[PDB]
Write a protein that binds this ligand. Structure first.
Ligand code: CDL
Ligand code: CDL
Ligand code: HEA
Ligand code: HEA
Ligand code: PEK
Ligand code: PEK
Ligand code: PGV
Ligand code: DMU
Ligand code: DMU
Ligand code: DMU
Ligand code: CHD
Ligand code: CHD
Ligand code: CUA
Ligand code: PER
Ligand code: CA
Ligand code: CU
Lengths: 56, 75, 72, 513, 44, 227, 258, 75, 72
């Protein structure tokens, strides 16, 4: 394999105002959206499950 | 015989092992006597002491387990 | 140095593993299972397990792990 | 922008602000629980129900006041706001991990409120002793939700401890030794070391309780060769350090408040104060079985725990005397914060001294599991930890907000709360000595007078809590902006203005050797 | 981000009456919760 | 039992409880004196316009601040540990009684000679007889001989409880799988009350202890009548 | 800025991690009591996503952006030491439980250790092999460290591969011993102490092996310099911790407890 | 009775503790049976086993020490 | 630094010694000497000692060290 670190240093230092968690490009946005959707949706489901479990 | 005397082997607040030891000693003694056809009367001291100290439910459970074959102490 | 730690890896550490692998190899093979006795301090069930029929441990081995009622 | 700033924070000040808001909300929940306790106890006979609903309330009261009010305010709130400013650091060592310490608390709190909503609640005491807390006597989800609540709070605090220790060791100006950091910074470092060592043992113990409840382990079940007393040792190995964790940041705030309102550049006997806090932290790990004097341990063990416990009075007395020596010769400013601090010195001393009474195992036989214990710990918590929180809040509110409180309203607040807490807890000594047990929904008729007066006290404290909300509203409503602050030369956290910019110490301080 | 008094907080202090409503809801919800939980337990 | 508006301990019924009252008197004098001195010194530090704000030397005064508290703690520990070891001394009991905690009542076992055992439950408020005490009376009292050293053994058949009688200086936790020992000796006949002292669920408040202390001859006849 | 410290970009991973903790704990509750794994599987998934993205971002910040000055690296060293201390105290609780039960065996056990009806594993068979495996892995990881400091890419990768192989061997041997064991977690306090203490250890071996695999792929991608490689140092410290815990388990539970 | 049977408590070449244990067991039993005025025939097994295994000089020394009050084992 | 180790010397180490000195000086009283029993495994004499009368140990204490024939 070859050392491609310099190419990643250029990408992640680009002066584009992106926070580090999105600076890799479109794949970062997709993985963020999947993560936050599962977190917020799972949290709403955990609250439904409490509602259910709160009564006999 | 009034009650179980102070036993220097068991001088502290926790008397669990005092009950256990006397229960074991009685049943070991009873087995050793019944085996030779000797006299279980020699075992009486251990019987009085464990009866004095041991909760009824502990004795009852241990007796049940000896009869079941599930008593985990060596007799 | 790296040279010394590689020397220890191949000259001491891996030979030790090979010898202990031999030793375990030689003492393997199934030993007979003990008579089942329904001891009250073993095969504890205060709540069913959250898998299977509730009565089998997670890595239940039918050959050596009896249920509360004995071997399967 | 709102989400980026307040849900995705990497800023020590904003994270501090989130902790203070969380702790304030938790304080209202804890106060409502305390009032339900005293509403039941304020008249003989049953008001609410049998001991189950009563002890669900008592249990929740304790977990809320400790884990959701005191620790988040003192450590998350004052610690995050003040520690970086007092060492000239640009933020915490791990500013993103800091945010996760905060966000673990709302879920922890949700699990505790779920515990109370499902089945019959966790009516266990905050100690969660088995077998009452086990799967036979507390069948169903309530205790498991309580255990998980404690797991999330524990992870929050463990990661926070790692963050504070690293920040305080690693991020001072290079010329600043540990012996040139302010006492509040020392108090947080020592608290963080206690958290790092104590919470993992709690985690082990409550994990064992979880497996006894759900995986057929028998750590605490004699049928399998377990021992309920093992749970008590593991819990209290955490629990005694936990009370030092609750007070130490309070001691650090009191040292700053007494110094400031005495017009002094420095507390009396700085190195003695450092010595005292490290001695208290250390001794706090070797005394836990004073919570177990009635369980049946050996006499020599009782003699050791009596003696080791009493030793804590020596470093603690050095702190009390050093506060008095800080007042000595002061140009005293009778600010509301100073009134909280003076109340602290006296009322904490009273509670510490009833602790020394309890340290005597022979007398503790008669006082254990009575209201004497309840009187002791509320003097040190409801009049110690809380008075340090209120003094620090009114002292630093203008730093955090840029606005001033109405000092006359704040003095009224102090006066009402002082009367209420003393009326609530002083008579509990009499209930304890005369044998009223803990965790009772109802009491023999003889105990009526003192329970009646105690409950009347609790209503006075409620009036104070309601007034405090109004006082914070009036400050934000009126918008009196800060102009000048005295003694900035010995109070670095004030030197960047009120409030300080989002980024402070972007250019670090200059300190030469 | 906005800096200065009234701007370093996650709630608005632009209108003291809107703020009173928000503070009422915030602290009032925490204080009310245990009463409603006790009611819930008693009604099972 | 406790009485209305009580400030201190129940009157001592046993020599050890007497010892605990005098030890509490000694300790409370110290607590009062230290509390009072701190309050006074606060008031002294706060009542002068005279000032001294330059650096103050701490080491001389810290000697006093550490040595005097160390001496006071020794003056508490010495009598404290004398009493601790006095309660632990070998005594030679005449009688052993067991108590087992349950949800929510106590059982008692007197098995030195005969299989005597019974359950002891709170008298419900609606069933109290005129002059009886709410939440304190039981149906079957723990009858015991006065002026005799008794071994009490305490355990539980369910959750934790704790067996307490304040006027005798007694509190022994009731732990399943464990047999805890204490000694009981009443100087006087009478009725001595206590209450369950470990949270044990729904009726923790409602499982009291009543000792009935009588002469040996009466105890022997009661014992025979309970078989 | 004219200090050397790292001002981190505002990040969603703290919130996603906190919510993953709520979903895992509410999920375990739902599994233990309401016969459903759904919430738990969502929580485990969000936890893995959060860890992946958080540590990915730390690599971006360090390897790709240069934020890890010596001062930042020194902070991380303290952070990892303090984390290891917290994990030592967690295991201490389990050792306390073990010694409490084994030093004073109750009548229910037969008043003996091991209890009546327990047939311990032979400590000289697979447990000794497991000991040789983790000790050997402590030697190979040290070789890897020196190779990296000496600038030797191939020998670093070989030594690290060997270390990971040994971690996997340990895990497979322990899995086999779990299956073969004639006692279970439900076999009283013997089974309780044995499986919870060795099970938390096994989890830490899996975590440590995963950390070493992350280091292996970073090394393959040339992230590490001969002087700057804190992720590798942290993984090695964690790995030595896992070794030492094993040695204490071996002496305490397998040998002295047999 | 021909000779002392294999005893799983003492399975190795070093039989010292087998001799010692059976000597103690005989004399503990003989003291128990004398204490109630029981019968020493009950103790016979232990006597045959120690007599079989123990060197005469060990038995003779231990006997002399019991008589002297210098036997260091608990009987 | 030196300052930290001095702080530990005077703030932890020497206080510990003082506390242990107090503890020892409280249990310094002479214990009741045990009945003499001429046990054959004690008071060993295979060769006379190379000092005194050959029958006294080097730090012989008459109060607590009996000779083979008993207390002096
Ligand atoms: C704002 C706050 C509002 C007020 C809050 C509630 C007020 C409570 C009122 C109490 C009055 C009781 C009463 O009926 O008084 C009659 C009562 C009649 O006297 P008595 O029946 O002969 O009492 C003698 C006892 O036998 C003496 O022996 P005993 O064994 O019966 O007494 C022991 C007992 C008795 O102790 C007391 O009497 C407490 C005194 C209160 C301190 C002020 O209790 C204690 O141990 C109390 C523990 C206190 C912990 C330490 C407190 C630190 C003191 C702070 C110093 C500041 C000084 C200024 O008079 C008093 O003693 C007054 C109290
Ligand atoms: C489990 C969760 C535990 C957390 C682990 C933390 C990992 C932190 C590393 C990280 O995030 O970096 C990725 C990251 C990928 O690159 P990037 O920053 O994302 O993109 C620009 C880079 O500068 C790119 O520069 P570079 O120098 O880093 O090159 C990386 C990459 C650049 O490629 C890209 O990432 C961009 C291209 C677009 C394609 C996007 C596909 C990636 C989606 C990842 C999904 C993972 C979700 C995990 C949760 C699963 C839940 C179901 O180039 C490649 O050709 C490699 C492909 C991606 C490698 C990562 C694949 C992860 C598989 C999932 C493993 C977890 C299980 O690369 C790094 O910065 C370092 C990566 C090198 C280490 C990766 C090692 C993974 C080892 C897995 C362990 C499995 C344990 C087995 C158990 C057995 C025990 C006995
Ligand atoms: C920090 C800990 C703490 C605090 C402050 C309190 C405060 C109070 N507690 Fe207590 N309590 C405990 C911890 C605490 N408690 C514990 C651990 C137990 C034992 C539980 C068990 O047995 O298992 C207990 C038990 C307990 C009992 C015994 C119950 C029984 O045994 O049956 C009683 C009885 O009256 C009581 C009453 C009160 C009252 C009336 C207050 C009042 O004084 C409260 C008044 C209100 C406040 C003090 C304000 C709170 C809010 C803030 C400070 C937020 C401020 C806002 C900003 C800074 C913006 N509590
Ligand atoms: C902030 C909280 C906090 C603090 C700081 C303390 C501090 C102390 N506590 Fe307390 N304690 C609790 C919170 C606290 N405690 C809680 C919550 C419980 C109950 C747990 C439960 O069961 O739910 C409790 C229970 C508890 C018990 C168990 C009683 C029982 O359950 O039977 C004991 C036993 O020794 C104890 C002792 C002490 C001592 C000796 C101190 C010392 O640190 C006090 C030292 C201070 C001083 C002594 C005052 C100042 C000193 C001077 C002015 C010098 C001169 C003094 C002398 C010479 C004496 N406390
Ligand atoms: C106070 C703190 C410690 C002080 C240390 C000892 C002081 C005196 C002797 C110094 C040398 C000690 C070294 C170890 C040797 C053996 C015994 C020393 C231990 C000792 O002092 O033990 C004393 C006996 O000494 C005895 O016999 C007689 C002791 C004198 C003769 C010793 C001769 C043996 C020398 C052997 C040399 C070998 C060297 C090895 C070299 C190796 C190189 C390859 C104990 O007194 P006691 O009355 O029996 O019991 C107390 C009753 N109240
Ligand atoms: C090869 C080693 C690797 C182990 C991985 C295996 C299993 C899943 C995960 C394990 C995690 C570690 C410890 C958790 C506790 C128990 C598992 C112990 C190890 C184990 O796997 O034990 C097994 C039982 O598993 C059981 O009950 C299974 C139980 C599964 C559910 C686990 C519940 C988790 C508990 C919550 C943890 C809380 C963490 C707290 C964090 C701190 C916060 C402050 C043993 O099998 P058995 O059939 O009884 O006997 C063998 C007979 N032939
Ligand atoms: C089935 C099991 C599921 C359970 C979930 C956990 C499973 C697996 C987790 C495995 C841990 C992987 C950690 C990967 C960290 C990658 C980031 C990293 O290593 O980051 C390094 C910094 O270290 C740092 O943050 C140090 C970061 C260290 C953190 C690791 C701590 C271990 C995590 C424990 C998690 C839970 C344990 C508790 C269980 C009870 C980056 O600096 P360098 O390396 O100097 O590079 C810079 C040079 O290139 C410049 O020239
Ligand atoms: C991005 C958003 C996040 C996604 C949220 C998804 C929520 C929807 C999940 C579906 O809900 C499920 O319903 C099943 C009902 O069929 C339950 O079955 C369980 O309960 C059954 C009751 O009939 C039993 O048969 C079994 O225990 C079991 O199948 C199961 O518990 C539950 O999860
Ligand atoms: C218990 C609270 C009582 C507090 C007592 C505090 C005593 C402080 C005295 C120390 O200050 C000194 O005062 C001297 C002038 O008078 C100075 O000359 C001296 O340099 C200085 O060190
Ligand atoms: C990406 C977001 C959208 C996807 C949302 C996820 C959807 C998953 C819903 C499925 O729910 C499951 O239903 C199973 C049965 O219907 C349950 O098995 C349960 O029942 C089995 C047999 O009925 C038992 O063997 C198991 O032990 C037991 O947990 C299982 O727990 C539960 O998870
Ligand atoms: C060909 C490649 C070169 C890597 C590089 O320099 O880019 C080599 C160098 C070291 C090699 C690794 C090491 O030799 C260790 C392993 C040896 C096994 O036989 C194959 C996998 C194994 C994990 C190897 C894979 C691969 O061939 C590597 C990574
Ligand atoms: C040596 C150390 C630091 C001094 C310095 O470097 O400034 C000081 C700080 C606090 C001091 C201690 C505290 O003042 C408390 C004690 C006071 C006594 O008079 C001496 C022992 C005593 C335990 C002190 C010993 C020593 O002088 C300490 C430990
Ligand atoms: Cu029984 Cu409380
Ligand atoms: O805990 O005092
Ligand atoms: Ca009522
Ligand atoms: Cu404590």
């Amino acid at each position: 394999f070859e050392n491609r670190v310099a190419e990643k240093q250029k990408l992640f230092q680009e002066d584009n105002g992106l926070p580090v968690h999105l600076k890799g490009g479109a794949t970062d946005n997709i993985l963020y959206r999947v993560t936050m959707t599962l977190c917020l949706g799972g949290t709403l489901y955990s609250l439904y499950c409490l509602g259910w479990a709160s009564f006999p | 015989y009034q009650t179980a005397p102070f036993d220097s082997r068991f001088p502290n607040q926790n008397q669990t092992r005092n009950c256990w030891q006397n229960y074991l000693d009685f049943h070991r003694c009873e087995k050793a006597m019944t085996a030779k056809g000797g006299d279980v009367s020699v075992c009486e001291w251990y019987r009085r002491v464990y009866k004095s100290l041991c909760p009824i439910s502990w004795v009852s459970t241990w007796d049940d387990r000896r009869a079941e074959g599930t008593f985990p102490g060596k007799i | 140095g790296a040279r010394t730690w590689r020397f220890l890896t191949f000259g001491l550490a891996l030979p030790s593993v090979a010898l202990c692998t031999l030793n375990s190899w030689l003492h393997s093979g199934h030993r007979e299972r003990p008579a089942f006795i329904p001891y009250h301090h073993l095969r504890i069930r205060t709540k069913p397990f959250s898998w299977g029929d509730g009565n089998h441990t997670f890595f239940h081995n039918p050959r050596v792990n009896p249920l509360p009622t004995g071997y399967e | 922008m709102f989400i980026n700033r307040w849900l995705f924070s990497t800023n020590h000040k904003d994270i501090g602000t989130l902790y203070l808001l969380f702790g304030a909300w938790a304080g209202m929940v804890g106060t409502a629980l305390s009032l339900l306790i005293r509403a039941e106890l304020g008249q003989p006979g049953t008001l609410l129900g049998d001991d189950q609903i009563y002890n669900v309330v008592v249990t929740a009261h304790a977990f809320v006041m400790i884990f959701f009010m005191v620790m988040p305010i003192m450590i998350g709130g004052f610690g995050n706001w003040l520690v970086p400013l007092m060492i000239g650091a640009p933020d915490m060592a791990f500013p993103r991990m800091n945010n996760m310490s905060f966000w673990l608390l709302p879920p922890s709190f949700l699990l505790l409120l779920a515990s109370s909503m499902v089945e019959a609640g966790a009516g266990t005491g905050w100690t969660v002793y088995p077998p009452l807390a086990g799967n036979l006597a507390h069948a169903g989800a309530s205790v498991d939700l309580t255990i998980f609540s404690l797991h999330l709070a524990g992870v929050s605090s463990i990661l926070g401890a790692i963050n504070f220790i690293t920040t305080i060791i690693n991020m001072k100006p290079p010329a600043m030794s540990q012996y040139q950091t302010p006492l509040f910074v020392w108090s947080v470092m020592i608290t963080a070391v206690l958290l790092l060592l104590s919470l993992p043992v709690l985690a082990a113990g409550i994990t064992m309780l979880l497996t006894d409840r759900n995986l057929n382990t028998t750590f605490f079940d004699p049928a399998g060769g377990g021992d309920p007393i093992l749970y008590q040792h593991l819990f209290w190995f955490f629990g005694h350090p936990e009370v030092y964790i609750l007070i130490l940041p309070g001691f650090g705030m009191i040292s700053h408040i007494v110094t400031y309102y005495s017009g002094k550049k420095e507390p009396f006997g700085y190195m003695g104060m450092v010595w005292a806090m490290m001695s208290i932290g250390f001794l706090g790990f070797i005394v836990w079985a004073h919570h177990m004097f009635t369980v049946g341990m050996d006499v020599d063990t009782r003699a050791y725990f009596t003696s080791a416990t009493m030793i804590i009075a020596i470093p603690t007395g050095v702190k009390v005397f050093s506060w008095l020596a800080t007042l000595h010769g002061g140009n005293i400013k009778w600010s509301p914060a100073m009134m909280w601090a003076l109340g602290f010195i006296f009322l904490f001393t009273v509670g510490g001294l009833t602790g020394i009474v309890l340290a005597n195992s022979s007398l503790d036989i008669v006082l254990h599991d009575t209201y004497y214990v309840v009187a002791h710990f509320h003097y040190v918590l409801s009049m110690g930890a809380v008075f340090a929180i209120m003094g620090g809040f009114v002292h630093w509110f203008p730093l955090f907000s840029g606005y001033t409180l109405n000092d006359t309203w704040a003095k009224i607040h102090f006066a009402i709360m002082f009367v209420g807490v003393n009326m609530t807890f002083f008579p509990q000594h009499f209930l304890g000595l005369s044998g009223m047990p803990r965790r009772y929904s109802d009491y023999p008729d003889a105990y009526t007078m003192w329970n009646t007066i105690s409950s009347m006290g609790s209503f006075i404290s409620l009036t104070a809590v309601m007034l405090m909300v109004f006082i914070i509203w009036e400050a934000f409503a009126s918008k009196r902006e800060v102009l000048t602050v005295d003694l900035t030369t010995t109070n670095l956290e004030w030197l960047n203005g009120c409030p300080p910019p989002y980024h402070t110490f972007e250019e670090p301080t200059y300190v030469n050797l | 981000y906005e800096e200065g008094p009234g701007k370093n907080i996650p709630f608005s202090v632009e209108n003291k009456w809107r703020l009173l409503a928000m503070m009422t809801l915030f602290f009032g919800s925490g204080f009310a919760a245990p009463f409603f939980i006790v009611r819930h337990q008693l009604l099972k | 039992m406790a009485y209305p508006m009580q400030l201190g301990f129940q009157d001592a019924t046993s020599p050890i409880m007497e010892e605990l009252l005098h030890f509490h008197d000694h300790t409370l004098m110290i607590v009062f004196l230290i509390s009072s001195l701190v309050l006074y010194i606060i008031s002294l530090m706060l009542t002068t316009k005279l000032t001294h704000t330059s650096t103050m030397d701490a080491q001389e005064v810290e000697t006093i601040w550490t040595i005097l508290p160390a001496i006071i703690l020794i003056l508490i520990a010495l009598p404290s540990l004398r009493i601790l070891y006095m309660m632990d001394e070998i005594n030679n009991p005449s009688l052993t009684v067991k108590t087992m905690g349950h949800q929510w009542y106590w059982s008692y076992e007197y098995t030195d000679y005969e299989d005597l055992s019974f359950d002891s439950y709170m008298i419900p408020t609606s069933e109290l007889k005129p002059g009886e005490l709410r939440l304190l009376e039981v149906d079957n009292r723990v009858v015991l001989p006065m002026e005799m050293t008794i071994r009490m053994l305490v355990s539980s058949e369910d959750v934790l409880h704790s067996w307490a009688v304040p006027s005798l200086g007694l509190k022994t936790d009731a732990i399943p799988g464990r047999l805890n020992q204490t000694t009981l000796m009443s100087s006087r006949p009478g009725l001595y009350y206590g209450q369950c002292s470990e949270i044990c669920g729904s009726n923790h408040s409602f499982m009291p202890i009543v000792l009935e202390l009588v002469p040996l001859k009466y105890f022997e006849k009661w014992s025979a009548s309970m078989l | 800025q004219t200090h050397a410290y790292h001002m981190v970009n505002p990040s969603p991973w703290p919130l996603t991690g906190a919510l993953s903790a709520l979903l895992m704990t509410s999920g375990l509750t739902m599994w233990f009591h309401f016969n459903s794994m759904t919430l738990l599987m969502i929580g485990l998934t969000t936890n893995m996503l959060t860890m992946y993205q958080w540590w990915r971002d730390v690599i971006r910040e360090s390897t790709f952006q240069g934020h890890h000055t010596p001062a930042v690296q020194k902070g991380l060293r303290y952070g990892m030491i303090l984390f290891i201390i917290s994990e030592v105290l967690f295991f201490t609780g389990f050792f306390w439980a073990f010694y409490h039960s084994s030093l004073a065996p109750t009548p229910e056990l037969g008043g003996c250790w091991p209890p009546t009806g327990i047939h311990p594993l032979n400590p000289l068979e697979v447990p000794l092999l497991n000991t040789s495996v983790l000790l050997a892995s402590g030697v190979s990881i040290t070789w890897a460290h020196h190779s990296l400091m000496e600038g030797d890419r191939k020998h670093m990768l070989q030594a690290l591969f060997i270390t990971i192989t040994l971690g996997v061997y340990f895990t497979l041997l322990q899995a086999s011993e779990y299956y073969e064991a004639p006692f279970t977690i439900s076999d009283g306090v013997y089974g309780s102490t044995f499986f919870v203490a060795t099970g938390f250890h096994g989890l830490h071996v899996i975590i440590g092996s995963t950390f070493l695999i992350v280091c292996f792929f970073r090394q393959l991608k040339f992230h590490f310099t001969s002087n700057h490689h804190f992720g590798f140092e942290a993984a090695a410290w964690y790995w030595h911790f896992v070794d030492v815990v094993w040695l204490f388990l071996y002496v305490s539970i397998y040998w002295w407890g047999s």
